[PDB]
Design a protein around this nucleic acid. Structure first.
Ligand SMILES: [Mg+2]
Ligand SMILES: [Mg+2]
Ligand SMILES: [Mg+2]
Ligand SMILES: [Mg+2]
Ligand SMILES: [Mg+2]
Ligand SMILES: [Mg+2]
Ligand SMILES: [Mg+2]
Ligand SMILES: [Mg+2]
Ligand SMILES: [Mg+2]
Ligand SMILES: [Mg+2]
Ligand SMILES: [Mg+2]
Ligand SMILES: [Mg+2]
Ligand SMILES: [Mg+2]
Ligand SMILES: [Mg+2]
Ligand SMILES: [Mg+2]
Ligand SMILES: [Mg+2]
Ligand SMILES: [Mg+2]
Ligand SMILES: [Mg+2]
Ligand SMILES: [Mg+2]
Ligand SMILES: [Mg+2]
Ligand SMILES: [Mg+2]
Ligand SMILES: [Mg+2]
Ligand SMILES: [Mg+2]
Ligand SMILES: [Mg+2]
Ligand SMILES: [Mg+2]
Ligand SMILES: [Mg+2]
Ligand SMILES: [Mg+2]
Ligand SMILES: [Mg+2]
Ligand SMILES: [Mg+2]
Ligand SMILES: [Mg+2]
Ligand SMILES: [Mg+2]
Ligand SMILES: [Mg+2]
Ligand SMILES: [Mg+2]
Ligand SMILES: [Mg+2]
Ligand SMILES: [Mg+2]
Ligand SMILES: [Mg+2]
Ligand SMILES: [Mg+2]
Ligand SMILES: [Mg+2]
Ligand SMILES: [Mg+2]
Ligand SMILES: [Mg+2]
Ligand SMILES: [Mg+2]
Ligand SMILES: [Mg+2]
Ligand SMILES: [Mg+2]
Ligand SMILES: [Mg+2]
Ligand SMILES: [Mg+2]
Ligand SMILES: [Mg+2]
Ligand SMILES: [Mg+2]
Ligand SMILES: [Mg+2]
Ligand SMILES: [Mg+2]
Lengths: 121, 161, 154, 119
RNA sequence: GAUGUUAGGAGGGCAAAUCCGCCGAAUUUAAGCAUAUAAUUAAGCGGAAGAAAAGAAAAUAACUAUGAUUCCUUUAGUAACGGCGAGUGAACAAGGACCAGCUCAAACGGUUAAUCCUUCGUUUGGUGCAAACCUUUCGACGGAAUUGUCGUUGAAUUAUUCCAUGAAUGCCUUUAAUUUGAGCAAAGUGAGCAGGAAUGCUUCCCCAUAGAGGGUGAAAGGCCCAUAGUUCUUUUUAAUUUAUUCAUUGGAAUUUUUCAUGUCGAGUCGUGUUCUUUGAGAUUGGAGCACUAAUACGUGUGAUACAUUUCACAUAAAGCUAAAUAUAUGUAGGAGACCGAUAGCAAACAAGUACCGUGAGGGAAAGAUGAAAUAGUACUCAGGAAUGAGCAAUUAAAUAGUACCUGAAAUCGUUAAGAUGGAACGGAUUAAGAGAGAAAACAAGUAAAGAGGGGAAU
RNA sequence: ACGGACCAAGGAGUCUAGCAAAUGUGCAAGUGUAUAUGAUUCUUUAAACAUUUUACGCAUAAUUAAUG
RNA sequence: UUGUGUUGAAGCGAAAUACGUGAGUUUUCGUGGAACAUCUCCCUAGUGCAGAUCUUGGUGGAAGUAGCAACUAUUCAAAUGAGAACUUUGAAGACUGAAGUGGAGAAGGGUUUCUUGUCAACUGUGAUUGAACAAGAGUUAGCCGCUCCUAAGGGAUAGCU
RNA sequence: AGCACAGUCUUAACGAUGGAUGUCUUGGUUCCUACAGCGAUGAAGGCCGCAGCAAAAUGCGAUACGCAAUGAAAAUUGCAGUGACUGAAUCAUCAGAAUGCUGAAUGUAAACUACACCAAUUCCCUGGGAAUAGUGGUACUCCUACAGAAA
């Protein structure tokens, strides 16, 4: 806003969003952590990895908790354990949820994650 | 051409569109210039970005009465001041080898101005602490406390106008 | 301003009269759907617009400094006058004095919340509410030119 | 699937030997692909990558040795020379640019652009 | 002088928007057209840079004089030029932006080239992990140079004061900025309704140095990215801090007094003549040719040719030089009271692409399913197959089925009603139909008793 | 007489320079702050504000080829 | 400036005891699935179409009409197949008639060659055929050419312009 | 089981055809800011390649949709395969390495992968041992230096 080096322009922003590199995608697919988690760490939001257990707030399944099977940076959607849905053929696939509509509980924690937490602190 | 209008004298028979400058950049350009000036001032810590110019009388029968800043002080005036040209150049003052004096009064005025300027100015030493007297015209190097005091006071730009 | 060579980058010329087609310039050659078609001219697909817009149009308007000053004065006067203010749309039913004068303590406020509270205390609660309400998505293509929201002036 | 840091230590001959082996392997893979097979068709890419890495390592080593050989000595092979834009190369060194005539230098020494706080 | 695949090097081409030379039109205007005008333009060719070019007075002025260029405001649409027609058209001053000056040649120095360069080196430093740079002084062996490099900017001589110098010990601090990348970054995922899904509607909360913008299954300050703000590091560049001692080689500015009046750019200026260019007018600049100078008492300007003479201002015929100034090119940012897929670049898409032209060249059309195809049509029946149908199936929605958003008009199909003797439609006024409708086209209130909603009094 | 098979979209007195009268507005023997500077101006801020602790334009005088 | 929206916006189609002299405005139903207004004032514009042998894109009547008439000419049976006048095989009858729809080559073309598939479109009728589409595969030289020489000529070296 | 003549024209409903309108929009547009040369150290341009399954575009160059290194950092995915539990999978950065053949193109040539000539060249190990017909170089003008001849 106040710094005239970064563009406000809507179109530009949209372009950036769509064409972001993988790292950028990873960064922007962050999710809110639970109240307890927040209390524990000065962190408000973390980029969600694989073995994180999440609770969904928005959508058709607005309360079904479960671990994340896969995250998709191409479509900006994470996939939960039991958000299963049969396709037309009958093949079972996961319903993709945007990280915004989800709040994470149990955290997958590696050295990198620890470092990130420390940085946040 | 028709009716009682002035005869058309709009010189647009050439490919004028090829050379239209619209100054959308005016105010912004000015701002930029100002910024640059500020930067320069900062770089030249304490010293004034502006150089001393002598008051001179404008030529022609129509501007004769008016006086304005001329570029450069003339050897004679420098001499009067008690300054070398080179020394003057090194300091704040512009020197003009080509300008000549035909007015004694004018010369006197110029020298007075120079004197005033000299009085106003305090010289920071070339090497730190080491207080040494100037060459030919340049005054003296003052001590540190004095310099500090001077700095604390507002640098006036009244002489340069 | 539209680009200078817009619609006119073509070498198209008119076939003349005896071909049973209008005499607008036509794109030369063949093979393409573009070949044979009307060239420039405001009526033609892919033509130049009528009077293409130019940077040298007068954008700014010089106004007499004095005039400007006068205008400012008038505005100030209006602001002083409660009725005028009311007309202008501000919710001034709950304010004692409309030339609103507040203590220098205001110049030192450091928190938006505090400011809001002060405003509320003054009587502008309603006004504030209105302002809050009035952020809304603009009708039209403005949305696409960095003018997405419209907000009333408090 | 050998990576760079393991190869920096190995002698050049050994590296060469490794490379040849890799090449041979690649050839075999290619042959297999050519024949009616799809078993190890995806293994080849990795091998190729490895080979490339090896080549890079060896090349770097070669370069280093060359550099060592041609340390100083005024002129140098144009590759080992500091490759920079032609214009820049042409351009005089800053020192050269600076170099003033003697009288000028003297003048500078005498009357430098002094700071003259005006109050 | 040739010659060398000798040793070391450089030029060539691409790219142009601004830039600098050349070269060079015509359409056009003059209501014709020939001078003019277009235009010292386009094209052509050659050359540079981040700017280029210009630039340190053979300047203007006629003043109480100004003082390199450039650029802006202005002079000024003025002086002037112009079949004195159409048209064209400066400069000085003045107000600014910015301001910077200089070195060759010539004079001088022969108790001596004091210079310069190639190659080979030699040894203290400072950074960097390396790679590398960055500086430091010192000699060789060659050359170049007396057809002239370097010092001096008249020459000495006095007083004054600086500047370089080298070694020991000495310190490397505190900030201000400025510019790069970084992190960190306030507060709801609360009722209820409707919905496929809130970011909506009510209502109870808050945060805001952050209520730009984007995303998120509909409008979100509080869901996420980012934003306001800061906390580092990067770039340099100011201020502040610590300098102190000893060695003398060299130089400089004034200031005295002597003595010296030096030097100052030639097929060049200039004139004549031709052509061009100019606002330049008995020629403004330039150029070709012919002629061809003067030494500072010179000779060149001082806008009418000339003679005789003043006066004022300059010091041509060698060169360099930052700043302001310009950019439709390229890249990278940021914008809009701009355009919204026949618009906007030709090009929102595998666009300078397909395709056309022998070739120079020409040159398109073409975006959108949904929130989600990790819901893209399963299955059954009829079909050679496409397709169709389903009691089946994804979806909120398939008349959203990939030619997929919305789906107009022309045109065509089905159904119904009607009309119909070589047009049809139409206007005016009815008519019979066929649809529509109740907000004037009737019923306020009163009573019995249900369903709701309110407001007030105490 | 010409143009029009039909339909949809596009499709034509515009913009700048200077002058003019008209009218509005401010100021008014003045007026216009030109460039440019200045700011406790910086999302908007390419605007707005300010004008140095006798600039110039047009007008206030005309007239003459002209010294005037 | 004060509002309308997923209890459905714009648009579109039909209308309406609708209002306006009129441009229009407003409303109802249906579709639609996301925005939309300002008339409170005025500010700005690439601002209003029936025509331009207008431009572009679409669509008609003509019209199921003109036509699908050079190269003498086909027929029967069978096969493949969903389906055969124009695919294949046999049997006739025929033509091309060595100045050949025969062999080879050049220019030009560029995978058209070949096998196995094969039919969305194309193959102006059909088509199971194909120079179409798909997957592969195919061009082997000391001797055949190019490669070497010079020709008309061309591009340059030295100059000179 | 019956019954409408047909056609032409008109109206309404529901469809076809078409892609208008509306709504969008990773594009343009102008303006502003900032920087601004690439090349014999082989450029721009053009060919030829390069993926496991690979046309175009995009990216790259015989190390060929990438290598190293740095900063992130668990995925990548149509399948096959490769990785994590951090020089590895993927990005970003890019300084190191590498950069086919050409093209100013520069050995002579050019509808040639034609042809000369001078170096044989290259790699390994701490002077030998391996290799390859492979790699360099050789244009024209010019400059400085050197060389030995000429007058
Ligand atoms: Mg256009
Ligand atoms: Mg609209
Ligand atoms: Mg060149
Ligand atoms: Mg000429
Ligand atoms: Mg004419
Ligand atoms: Mg005419
Ligand atoms: Mg040109
Ligand atoms: Mg250049
Ligand atoms: Mg220059
Ligand atoms: Mg001027
Ligand atoms: Mg005037
Ligand atoms: Mg002219
Ligand atoms: Mg929606
Ligand atoms: Mg001279
Ligand atoms: Mg002329
Ligand atoms: Mg004069
Ligand atoms: Mg110059
Ligand atoms: Mg277009
Ligand atoms: Mg719904
Ligand atoms: Mg529909
Ligand atoms: Mg939609
Ligand atoms: Mg549709
Ligand atoms: Mg006619
Ligand atoms: Mg007709
Ligand atoms: Mg027509
Ligand atoms: Mg229209
Ligand atoms: Mg008026
Ligand atoms: Mg509307
Ligand atoms: Mg128009
Ligand atoms: Mg029309
Ligand atoms: Mg009409
Ligand atoms: Mg048409
Ligand atoms: Mg046939
Ligand atoms: Mg016969
Ligand atoms: Mg016959
Ligand atoms: Mg044959
Ligand atoms: Mg065949
Ligand atoms: Mg057929
Ligand atoms: Mg076949
Ligand atoms: Mg084919
Ligand atoms: Mg033979
Ligand atoms: Mg030969
Ligand atoms: Mg010959
Ligand atoms: Mg020739
Ligand atoms: Mg009938
Ligand atoms: Mg790597
Ligand atoms: Mg790493
Ligand atoms: Mg060659
Ligand atoms: Mg040949």
């Amino acid at each position: 806003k106040f710094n005239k080096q970064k563009s406000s322009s809507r179109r530009k922003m949209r372009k950036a969003h769509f064409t972001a590199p993988a790292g950028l995608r990873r960064k922007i697919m962050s999710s809110k952590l639970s109240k307890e988690l927040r209390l524990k760490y000065k962190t408000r939001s973390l980029p969600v990895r694989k073995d994180d257990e999440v609770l969904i707030c928005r959508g058709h399944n607005h309360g079904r908790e479960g671990k994340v099977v896969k995250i998709n940076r191409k479509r900006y959607k994470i996939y939960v354990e039991r958000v299963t849905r049969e396709k037309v053929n009958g093949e079972s696939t996961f319903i993709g949820i945007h990280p915004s509509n989800v709040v994470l509980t149990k955290l997958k924690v590696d050295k990198n994650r620890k470092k990130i937490l420390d940085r946040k602190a | 051409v028709a009716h009682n209008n002035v005869l058309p004298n709009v010189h647009l028979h050439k490919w004028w569109q090829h050379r239209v400058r619209v100054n959308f950049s005016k105010n912004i350009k000015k701002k930029k210039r100002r910024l640059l000036r500020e930067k320069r001032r900062k770089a030249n810590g304490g010293t004034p970005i502006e150089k001393l110019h002598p008051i001179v009388h404008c030529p022609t029968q129509r501007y004769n009465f008016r006086t304005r800043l001329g570029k450069g002080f003339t050897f004679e005036e420098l001499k009067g001041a008690g300054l070398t040209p080179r020394a003057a150049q090194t300091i704040g003052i512009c020197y003009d080898k080509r300008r000549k004096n035909r007015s004694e009064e004018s010369l006197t005025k110029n020298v007075e101005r120079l004197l005033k300027y000299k009085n106003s100015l305090v010289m920071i030493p070339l090497k730190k602490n080491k207080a040494k007297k100037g060459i030919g015209g340049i005054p003296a190097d003052a001590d540190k406390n004095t310099i500090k005091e001077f700095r604390n006071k507002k640098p006036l730009l009244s002489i340069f106008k | 301003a539209v680009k200078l060579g817009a619609g006119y980058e073509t070498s198209a010329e008119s076939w003349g009269t005896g071909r049973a087609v209008a005499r607008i310039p036509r794109v030369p050659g063949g093979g393409t759907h573009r070949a044979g078609q009307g060239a420039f001219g405001n009526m033609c697909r892919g033509g130049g617009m009528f009077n293409p817009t130019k940077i040298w149009r007068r954008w700014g308007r010089k106004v007499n400094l004095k005039e400007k000053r006068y205008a400012v004065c008038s505005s100030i006067a209006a602001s002083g006058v409660t009725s005028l203010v009311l007309a202008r749309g501000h919710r001034i039913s709950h304010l004692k004095e409309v030339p609103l004068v507040v203590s220098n303590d205001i110049e030192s406020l450091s928190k938006t919340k505090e400011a809001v509270n002060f405003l509320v205390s003054l009587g502008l609660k309603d006004e504030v509410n209105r302002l809050v309400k009035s952020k809304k998505i603009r009708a039209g293509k403005g949305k696409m030119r960095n003018r997405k929201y419209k907000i009333r002036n408090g | 699937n050998v990576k760079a840091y393991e190869l920096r230590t190995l002698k050049k001959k050994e590296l060469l030997d490794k490379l040849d082996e890799l090449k041979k392997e690649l050839s075999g893979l290619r042959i297999s692909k050519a024949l009616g097979n799809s078993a190890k068709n995806s293994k080849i890419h990795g091998v190729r990558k490895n080979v490339a890495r090896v080549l890079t390592v060896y090349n770097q080593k070669r370069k280093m040795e060359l550099r060592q050989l041609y340390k100083n000595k005024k002129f140098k092979p144009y590759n080992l020379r500091k490759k920079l834009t032609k214009n820049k190369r042409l351009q005089l060194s800053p020192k050269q640019k600076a170099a003033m005539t003697l009288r000028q230098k003297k003048k500078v020494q005498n009357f430098p652009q002094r700071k003259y706080l005006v109050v």
